[PDB]
């Protein structure tokens, strides 16, 4: 009947849409509520019997795999999943089953060794979650089967050393070398990066496997992994910026259930997944879902059914899999890789498991989760269970079962023995005029039929004029630096919020056709020599998403992935970079000292007191200076276009991997005094300390100076204009262009040229507790006591905010600084 | 045939929104691009296919795109389905005229603002004015449900319009001393406000408020939630209340690019149904003008809609055409009804356009030439809706002309009113019985309650400490909070694993070994011995794994209820940098910027113990750098009793100021770090502490030639070394209150050591960290006769808070102790 056939259609849709709500995914079965005509079952429907349709639906959607995919908007993706999930799956070969068991044996023997040999390692234990090892193995093996080049992993602490041994393939001698509290991070080896080669067992392919470094800040590494992968993909000419659509470098990202639901950086990183500036062709996510977060239950950790519900944001398919079924876990891992290869989109695997040990050393987890731990106490391991089931199903003989147990024992013996044996042993930046002229000419070498917006056309003509006649402004000097690096063969990646045009309408790195909307990148012409051959260089410029945390994390990641790239991230205003504070604190400022991991990332932070309020005034110079330690970063605030040009060229050509923090201008972009001569680009270098041009080039007399004003940034021009207005020959203004490391020798040598100075003042726009004064006021009299003893401060008064909220108050305070400096 | 119909119905319900006419600009030209005899056949409840298809097209493919089949609760899917799939009778002309009056009021405000003042184009609501009759419908529907208050959080776009036409603030207050291509134009764009909404066609009124915010888009989102939650707790409504009304409604506005890119959005959505954070569902309005400064949506997000993040918590989503203010008002009322029925978030994606540019003097056709050639052909929302009402025969020409008179009068009124405005232009000690009561409370277990065998000694020890002394840090904290509850104060404590405590020291909540039932010993102190309530309460929760949203929430909670004691605890101080935007933009600076006060406490476990650079520092140097006179109190107590007095002073001083506490980890179990009963019953907070051998023992201060100034747990190590070597020539002085510096108490303490020849600031932290960067510069300036020649003893300056090796940590710690006694 038509009514009966309709009930079947509704039944099929119910299993496809909501079957996952009844699938037997929890190996602990904590929730019992979850589970709570006969003649029609043998009737054929449109041609299969109802019982056979219902058996296929129960096997596919209500067994050990919960499939969520009907939320996906692309019908072809829903169809692809449906077809692969709704078929009579042939059980794996005994060889495949034995191989999964061997990986479970290796994982368990590793955990047993680690928890028996050392005392304080329980909090990092993978016990109850060992099925993640044959699962990761299946991901990597499937990537090798597709002929891909590398799998890059990011993960937290749980099972880290097991992943090093059984996935990366690192030897025990390297893993437990100089191996080391009830809480906190263990050995530094729980944080370091690693590289290895994975060799297929039943295939003839190999693939590179790497693991990126990370802090204890859960999920903070997520955008770093994406950036590192994208840099590697651009190097291999694969993916978005490549010749092929393979995206042959795969991000494999591990997570914990509580961190995946609560950390905002997860959503920000998922949001990058299909962006032209940030896509990596889909990430394979594995959530180690042990249904606990330290002592916190999932009902206090999230407001949704699953810890993975955030991934619905980008229409990713989600697979909830029972961690006690390593075959279903391996099968889902392979399906995930196939989906990622077919659609270049993220796949999330929610592996339901348990945490056998506590949240900290000496923890009795039944104190806060008595019910969960009374169930965990009855649980046998996933290895013993999978071995028991294979004999139960008659898949392996009793002899084969004992050999598997002696493989376990041999694996345990080997790591004890190997660690026992280990314990027994224990450049010029100036360019030629022709280079400047070429970059100028590039702004007018428009494609045939291209229509420039009438307001952009004068910018291009003025850049040709500047290249040939001088008075080069800040925005053009930046493009002269990047353009000349591209001409020399360097990859330049520039990104940030509205960075193609520039927040202050100054950059125009990308220009838009007035009639078609087609994008044109003038600096990209520098990637080709006049002979028509490539330089090897490239200009990659993007408008970022409205993120700071993920975007800064990505760019840091990108510089790690390709140390030969020039990577710049620009804040809309330096004031918004505090949204990426975790990246600044945990990776950029400290990654080198903590993990030996190097980055040459540039942060461009528009900075300056101009009356636009406390969120459009400061990049927090004082915070970056406080983070600095010898050799960790370079911190600068250039006052001239040419000095900024030389700063960027020195950074890209010095052969050193060190982050550069630049406090960049806003109104000073259009200050007509803030322009440079051609000779400043062709016959000079970066100057960490600058004197007034009247003393280095003019008829100024340094011996008339009794008051020395030390400063940095745009306030120089205001100080210099007041000096000229009042003909103050008794006053000299010295700029500190490089704030960190302090240019001690150049500063001492410059000050020695003013012998009649009776008083020295550090002049700054920022409040007394901000800017360079908190560090300079303490460091300058200590590093140079014969020069800075008695150094006094001229600044805004100390404030709890970077500035006043009133532009009227700003103007009064600015004038007060100028009147004090010349009082 | 019947099967094809079932599939057709599901296709409209699930994907009809992909074909709905939601974009007023119709930028995507590919968006729109079994038999006719079956159309007249009745299907199964018995309706013709033509009728089923008309209802489905009207409900899902007109000016409203409905997303709801992702919702796992079947009763919620059914509720939406039933209200959306009905033959909707067109509104009454009076209702249409009311919607027009709100568009009249919205456009007259924008015309005035963009004509009277220069530099206002980047904040313009032009192209998005339909958000005003939409917000009006939200608030009017909340008043119709008899609710108490609507609290709004929004960015700059249409902020003053909302002040005038939603909050009801007069023009004289909005434009008072009203003050440039970029940034924030006026402080009025950031300030909080409060008003009363009076219904037009009803007899209800409702309070309407707007919370303060920085320019950091979406950062205010968790702050709004905390604020509303505190107001709900005060009204005894919602989760911690007698009724399930949740009578205070969060109304949260957003921009399309910020809603998709900011992680704090997901973190705040994640709080929506949590017992410690739920507010009964938030009404979200996304002002989706399909642009983010100069950035197109394809570079801003990886999903079809800017609102796709809201699917995380199964919120229903309504995409509505901003050129249809009737559909916009209808969806707003439906959203309020859903929120009231299910106590869950509702998201309204209002598709509109941004008439002006991203900054003053911007020509947005430079970067979006196609969008702006379409915007240039667009007539305003008010003129379009007026023209539509004329064509549909809903209003006569006289009625349309009277609507234009109403518009013209509203525009004249603002100009005139602003023209007229321009013409005029405590003891913290408790009694022994209080300590004994808090001790006894730990053993006053409910009938049949089974204590975990490892928790029972903690309870018994607490009874012992209360009566015999040697009170440890963890108990001293509960003595402070418990005594405040006994005095009638609401105490809210939360953070990651805060019920048990990260270091298994707190046990604020204990769990029944057999049933899992929670017991809160301090909640017994909310009742007097005679049985009457004190008016106090203990609200303690395990937070989600968030820092940004959790810190934002607690800050907002203290703003919502200034009489509450609100404490947020970091698992380790090292993770608080994930909440840097809240520290920088609200906690440290809200008072100076907006006059907005908070008494929030941040508890940051801190100390060098060899657990690595992410389990060592709460970054004291960063909080000290943020501090300015009167903004915050910053402390690092060394004794349980001093921490007790610090919390009691904070809760009872009648001052709304954040308190930053650097709390211990191993020092929780240090047997020397214990206090006597008399320290709680006959003392007070001590900003400076001397060694007990000089204040209570036989020590001689005149023998001291070397003074060691320090803070925190390193004191005990310095004191133990002094004892071991009998170093009478050395004295150790602790600075318990780091900010504001206790200048007088410090000077008076140091005057008691006349023979001191050298002074050293001793700290565990690297030289560029801890208190030395600020103290090394401030102490010789504020007290030159005491600290000229002050020298530092510390770890060497580092780019990380510590070494990654516990072996390196131990060597460096011993080096500090040997230098201090060298
Ligand atoms: C950003 C951040 N916040 C807090 C912590 C402290 N912390 C360490 S483990 C833990 C609970 C983690 O739960 P989950 O994500 O489910 O992982 P699991 O330990 O269960 O594998 C927390 C809150 C952290 N390391 N990082
Ligand atoms: C956290 C943060 N990052 C960056 C900015 C700078 N910013 C100001 S407006 C803008 C674009 C906003 O787009 P959208 O959210 O769609 O709002 P709209 O201006 O279109 O209403 C940005 C990136 C900011 N204010 N806050
Ligand atoms: Ca370099
Ligand atoms: Ca207070
Ligand atoms: Mg977990
Ligand atoms: Mg927008």
UniProtKB/Swiss-Prot annotation, chain A:
Provide the residue positions that the database annotates as binding thiamine diphosphate: 158, 216, 218, 257-259, 290
For molecular function, the Gene Ontology terms on record are: 2-hydroxy-3-oxoadipate synthase activity; 2-oxoglutarate decarboxylase activity; dihydrolipoyllysine-residue succinyltransferase activity; magnesium ion binding; oxoglutarate dehydrogenase (succinyl-transferring) activity; thiamine pyrophosphate binding
Summarize what gene deletion causes: Cells lacking this gene do not show any ODH activity, in contrast to wild-type, demonstrating that this protein is part of a functional ODH complex in mycobacteria.
- The residues the record assigns to binding 2-oxoglutarate are 191, 216, 616
- Is Acetylation among this UniProt entry's keywords? no
List positions binding Mg(2+).
Answer: 257, 290, 292
Effect of mutating residue 658 to A: Loss of activation by acetyl-CoA
- Which keywords describe this protein according to UniProt? Acyltransferase, Allosteric enzyme, Coiled coil, Decarboxylase, Lyase, Magnesium, Metal-binding, Multifunctional enzyme, Oxidoreductase, Thiamine pyrophosphate, Transferase, Tricarboxylic acid cycle
The terms describing its cellular component in GO are: cytosol; oxoglutarate dehydrogenase complex
- UniProt protein name: Multifunctional 2-oxoglutarate metabolism enzyme
Query: What results from changing residue 616 to A?
Result: Loss of KG decarboxylase activity
EC code(s) of this entry: 2.2.1.5, 4.1.1.71, 1.2.4.2, 2.3.1.61
The biological pathway it contributes to is: Carbohydrate metabolism; tricarboxylic acid cycle; succinate from 2-oxoglutarate (transferase route): step 1/2; Carbohydrate metabolism; tricarboxylic acid cycle; succinyl-CoA from 2-oxoglutarate (dehydrogenase route): step 1/1
Q: Which family does it belong to?
A: Belongs to the 2-oxoacid dehydrogenase family. Kgd subfamily.
Q: Where is this region: 2-oxoglutarate dehydrogenase E1, C-terminal part?
A: 1-823
Gene Ontology BP terms: tricarboxylic acid cycle
Interval of the full protein contained in this chain: 363 to 1227 of 1227
What this chain does, per the entry, is described as: Shows three enzymatic activities that share a first common step, the attack of thiamine-PP on 2-oxoglutarate (alpha-ketoglutarate, KG), leading to the formation of an enamine-thiamine-PP intermediate upon decarboxylation. Thus, displays KGD activity, catalyzing the decarboxylation from five-carbon 2-oxoglutarate to four-carbon succinate semialdehyde (SSA).
